[PDB]
Design brief:
Peptidase_M20_dimer (chain B), elongated, alpha+beta, binds zinc ion, metal-binding (chain B), metalloprotease (chain B), cobalt (chain B), homodimer, 470 residues, six-stranded mixed sheet, 31% helix, EC 3.4.13.18 (chain B), Aminopeptidase, 2 domains, nine-stranded antiparallel sheet
Chain lengths: 470, 472
């Protein structure tokens, strides 16, 4: 499969298990390989790989360039088995690692080659992008000699990213008080079959959050059906902080006829189907009898947990006025769990601007106070603000338009790239992000468009061939 | 009484002459009925006071489907006559609301009745009561009363646009209890936010306009979260003027101990943040800090904290954009007034949705908030939305005429604001309905103005439709 060097590298990248905390084997393999070619190869304290290669003949007075990619991939320690589908490539029943392995392979392909024009070259392969961007955060400053950085972590052909959102984890704990269970019945209200998505790139859509839809039901039920005597026994939903939840469950104990609960579920199921129709075709509520616990939440605890999580802000907080068709600030709750004595909600706050993040954090701290819970903030990273001017963008646009035959789109993404952290440590470096079309990253649905990788290559190499004088 | 079409404008001029604010419609209603009767038209009012006038088909239009033109009698006063004038290509009232909403539509329906040389089928003119304070007319409209098979609502306010649908609405008032303490704090200053744009809480909610009440609450919340050693409590808190207007001003009175500069700094830093965030959208936003007389009693700190945090969390703005319709907000809400009363803080909101279950969801949200905050939600003024018909022959004709008159095709939309059509279609399911009207800007605002050449284009579309209504 062409281009040989890129794909032979990707094939090799797949062979070495390299999930988001087992990066060593790949990191060491790459360092070793670099040294056998006579390339400078180093790792910083945090473990970021830096390789260097001199300018090609005739390219010596031209601005030095670092191609940057992240080492790790999402596992959602044994090797990856890929295959060619049609015009696509995918891993056998798992995440492929096209994010960010194709970018990385292309950077090494350039290093390996002897017939690609490029200036003085760095290749920076960062640690742990996918779990709190530890590499980018602890990158050694005054280390890179490059004046230009080409981040290869964008995932859409014909698009050049010049910006991205920053992020921050927020965890809400709400206390659980229990009572002895003396209720006649125990059933789970089960919600399933939602689309899901990536809580950044898909937050703009009309897609629904399963945790929030269940909480909507329970709030309405408690509000409108005061003679339905029940309390929660437990409650949960979702899987991962930055994924839109697709399943949720609440265990309910109650007195009286099961049919009362059944009817409430039905009427709500029918309402929500009317509302979501095209957007959530597979949404299903079920009502499933379960073993009766010895202890359950107190009635007051139930009301506090239901009403808190129903009011809980979720989704688009603000759309951008400055940039076109971009969410400025959002948040999403990806996991809900009932632990000993607390109910835990796991959220990712996103914004292009720092003050949008802090504002959401203010909202959550207001909610927690009303509800006598607590917010824990962690994992804060800065966004990537579009530069006022960029020479590398000018060139990247010129080349992309030559290769495609139509103009490319210049955008900022409502998700996390490392560029904000990198520009934090290297403010004078002119930065851009590109990359071929990769679908459904972070998930076992991960596909990479074959011809987009070729177009990407021609654009990459085209840019490298034409970097201007210092 | 100068401009053309004469009959419409002479009628509008008459309409302005008769004070007709949203509960003093009597004088106008009686003026219209008596006038109708002098022309030998059937003229009646129903139990609620809606005016119905009837006029036969013009010669040659006898086998054609009967039509009712509908407008509302009342205008928003935010009992003395109105003083209009011709600015440029615009008409305005002398320092007040004009009544172009819905007086121009109403004038046009009366002009048609008055005419003797405009083709039209068997005609009705329905003028509804009290549209601007809860659609009392439309709610209480007599059924099996109108003989018309087609209704043309005239309450749309944009040239070249045909509306086939609209939002329903519901008033939501949240009361939060106040507990007081004797004031023994050293200082009393007001944090004054002014200079925001404002707007209509329906049609402008999709924009990035800010809400003066919500912005203040954001400051106050952040201050209390981040400045734990700043010893203060609220003395009172207010904002806005009217439920369906986006608030442009708000004030909190704070009493506090220690240096005034601590609060100066907190405002200054927040004012700078918000100015950066809203650069484009809110260029005139100004925070000031104004010394005020020290009250005898102030809120307790627990109370101050409950009310600051409830109202920061309080959902405001777009709740959901439509999936089925392009570029239309499906569900929103807006807090339009905040007031400190004896023993309660009152928040005055309008909830809007195109669908009933969107309204009820927002209602649920609010009732969850109020539970947490130990206050109360009161719901009132519920009205249904207007769901686009699966098919409409009057739309087709409207589409054709408008395209002929304009030269380009018109836009066919559903609007995120209240029209009476939801209520009317409720009572008259079999009537084919559509909404049109001339460009009117800043209705409800004393900046209300109507574009004169638009009223002339509207006239040609109205009369063109009436001339071509098909056979029964
Ligand atoms: Zn990724
Ligand atoms: Zn990546
Ligand atoms: Zn109005
Ligand atoms: Zn109106």
């Amino acid at each position: 499969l062409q281009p040989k060097l890129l794909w032979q590298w990707f094939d090799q990248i797949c062979a070495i298990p390299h999930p988001s905390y087992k990066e060593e084997q790949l990191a060491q393999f790459i360092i070793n390989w670099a040294k056998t070619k006579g390339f400078f190869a180093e790792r910083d304290e945090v473990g970021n790989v830096l390789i260097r290669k001199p300018a090609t003949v005739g390219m010596e007075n031209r601005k030095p360039v670092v191609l940057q990619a992240h080492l790790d991939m999402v596992p959602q320690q044994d090797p990856i088995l890929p295959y060619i589908d049609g015009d696509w490539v995918k891993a056998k029943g798992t995440t492929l690692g096209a994010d960010n392995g194709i970018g990385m392979a292309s950077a090494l392909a350039v290093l390996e080659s002897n017939d690609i024009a490029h200036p003085e070259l760095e290749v920076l392969l960062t640690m742990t992008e996918e779990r709190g961007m530890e590499g980018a955060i602890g990158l050694r400053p005054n280390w890179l000699r490059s004046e230009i950085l080409i981040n290869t972590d964008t995932e859409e052909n014909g698009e050049i990213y010049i910006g991205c959102a920053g992020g921050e984890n927020a965890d809400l704990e709400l206390p659980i008080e229990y009572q002895v269970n003396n209720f006649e019945h125990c059933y789970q209200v089960v919600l399933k079959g939602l689309r899901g998505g990536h809580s950044g790139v898909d937050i703009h859509t009309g897609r629904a959050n399963a945790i929030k839809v269940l909480l909507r039901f329970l709030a309405e039920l408690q509000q409108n059906q005061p003679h339905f005597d029940f309390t929660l026994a437990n409650i949960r939903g979702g899987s991962i902080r930055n994924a839109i939840p697709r399943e949720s469950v609440a265990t309910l104990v109650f007195n009286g006829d099961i049919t009362v609960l059944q009817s409430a579920v039905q009427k709500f199921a029918d309402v929500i189907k009317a509302e979501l129709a095209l957007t959530e075709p597979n949404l299903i509520f079920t009502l499933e009898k379960v073993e009766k616990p010895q202890q359950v939440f107190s009635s007051q605890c139930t009301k506090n947990i239901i009403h808190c999580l129903n009011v809980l802000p979720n989704g688009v907080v603000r759309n951008s006025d400055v940039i076109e068709n971009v969410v400025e600030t959002s948040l999403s709750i990806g996991v809900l769990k009932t632990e000993d004595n607390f109910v835990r909600s796991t959220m990712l706050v996103r914004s292009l601007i720092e003050s949008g993040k802090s504002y959401v954090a203010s909202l959550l701290k207001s909610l927690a106070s009303l509800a006598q819970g607590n917010i824990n903030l962690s994992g804060d990273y800065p966004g990537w603000e579009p530069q006022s001017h960029s020479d590398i963008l000018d060139l990247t646009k010129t080349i992309y338009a030559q290769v495609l035959g139509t103009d490319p789109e210049i955008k900022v993404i409502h998700a996390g790239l490392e560029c904000g952290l990198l520009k934090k440590i290297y403010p004078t470096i002119d930065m851009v992000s590109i990359g071929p079309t990769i679908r459904n990253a972070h998930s076992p649905d991960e596909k990479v468009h074959i011809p987009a990788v070729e177009t990407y290559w021609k654009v990459l190499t085209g840019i490298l061939a034409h970097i201007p004088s210092r």
